[PDB]
Amino acid sequence: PDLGWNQLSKYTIFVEDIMVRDVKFVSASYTYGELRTLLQTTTVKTLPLVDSKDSMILLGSVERSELQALLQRHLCPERRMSPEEIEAWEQEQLSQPVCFDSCCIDQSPFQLVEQTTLHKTHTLFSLLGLHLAYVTSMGKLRGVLALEELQKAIEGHTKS
Amino acid sequence: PDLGWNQLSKYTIFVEDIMVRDVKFVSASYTYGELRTLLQTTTVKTLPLVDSKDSMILLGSVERSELQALLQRHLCPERRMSPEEIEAWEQEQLSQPVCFDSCCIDQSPFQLVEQTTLHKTHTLFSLLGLHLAYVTSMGKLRGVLALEELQKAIEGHTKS
């Protein structure tokens, strides 16, 4: 269900309510403990890459596949084993900062608009097939978007 | 002259060198003196609207037509005349902060990418017909873009 977009009525629509604020992401500052935790937490293929979780400033986008590989390349005991060495190995590695040097990290523009202006910019979101790994508040991870969330809003608007 | 875009060679291309850094704009903080100065300075139809020129943080985009109207609606002596009153009127008004309440001010997304990544994102700039009133560095006016500037870069790349 869609519309494209009919800019024919006096309503405002907030992209901030459309986007998911509960975003799971990886930060450059993570330990292998935190990386594992994230990978266990979410199965989303493309995540935000944050410089520091305490700032939320993005460095780019990153594929889960390589976040997982990076973890495995370090936690595996054979990357050099008694059960004692196996358990120690994983724990020692989990405590270390993550070497995010080889991961599939890349850039992505993002379709973020000024809140209310969805009542016009829906036009673009429909045309561009909205699907983002993130949107940011001037660099800081704000949330994630999909056309599906807007389609629900479009139906609402259309009926209204 | 264009190409669309062939992502077939190991080059980097900087959007920061493509964009014009010498950007004329209007700030919300302007006086009618500054507004007049700007309007005399540039004839570009759509300008950036800056909160304060000392921060460069954008509020939105604004049409020159209404920046001019706003000026005229205040500087004109009849908006109430001896030559003494006429000269005094304009000067008194030029010294005041600008009432940017009724101008054609609106929002615009902008195609800004991470410097070097034009070597891939040229794809988008060509497809989207690049023409912006601004690009910003996380909110701060950074410069302005047009496909024409990229087309020169495309020719360079293509030959290279």
Q: B127 CB near a chain A CB, below 8 Å? A: no
**Closest residue in chain A to residue B108, using alpha carbons only:** A113
Interface contact flag, B114 A107, Cβ < 8 Å: yes
DSSP A98: P
Query: What amino acid is encoded at A99 in this protein?
Result: C
Distance in angstroms (rounded) separating the CA atoms of residues B41 and B39: 5
Backbone angles phi, psi at B13, to 5 degrees: -135, 125
Chain centroid to CA B155: 26
Q: Which helix (H) or strand (E) holds A153?
A: helix A147-159
CA distances from B50 to A93, A146, B54, B59, B136 (A): 49, 30, 9, 6, 11
State how far the alpha carbon of A112 is from the alpha carbons of A116, A118, A144, in Å: 11, 10, 10
CB B72 within 8 A of CB B119: no
> How far is residue B35's CA from residue B103's CA, in Å, rounded to a whole number?
12
Q: Are strands B46-50 and B26-27 parallel, antiparallel or unpaired?
A: parallel
User: Phi and psi of B117, rounded to 5°?
Assistant: -70, 0
d(Cα A56, Cα B152) in Å, to the nearest integer? Answer: 36
Pairing relationship of beta strands A58-63 and A46-50 according to DSSP bridges: antiparallel
d(CA A71, CA A62): 14
Coarse DSSP helix, strand, coil percentages of chain A, rounded to the nearest 5 percent: 40, 20, 40
Residue B51, exposed/middle/buried by CB under 10 A (0-12, 13-18, 19+)?
middle
- Establish if B111 touches chain A: CB-CB under 8 angstroms: yes
B113 vs A107, A117, A121: nearest CB: A107
CB nearest to A139's CB, from B60, B107, B138:
B138
Structure obtained using: cryo-EM
Distance separating alpha carbons of residues A108 and A63, to the nearest angstrom: 12
Calculate Rg over the CA atoms of chain A. Answer: 20
Chain A CB contacts of B117 under 8 Å are: 107
Residue A1 near residue A23, CB atoms below 8 Å: no
Helix (H, G, I), strand (E, B) or coil at B87: helix
Task: Among A111, A117, A139, select the one facing B107 at the smallest CB separation.
Answer: A117
Tell me how far apart the terminal alpha carbons of chain A are, to the nearest angstrom.
Answer: 15
From residue B58, give the alpha-carbon distance in Å to each of A85, A125, B15, B50, B115.
57, 22, 19, 4, 20
In Å, what resolution does this model reach? 3.4
Amino acid at A97: P
Look up residue B18 and give its amino acid: I
For the record, the structure tokens of A138 come out as: 């001037």
Q: Which residues of A touch B132 (CB under 8 A)?
A: none
Which of B60, B113, B138 is the closest to A138 by Cβ? B138
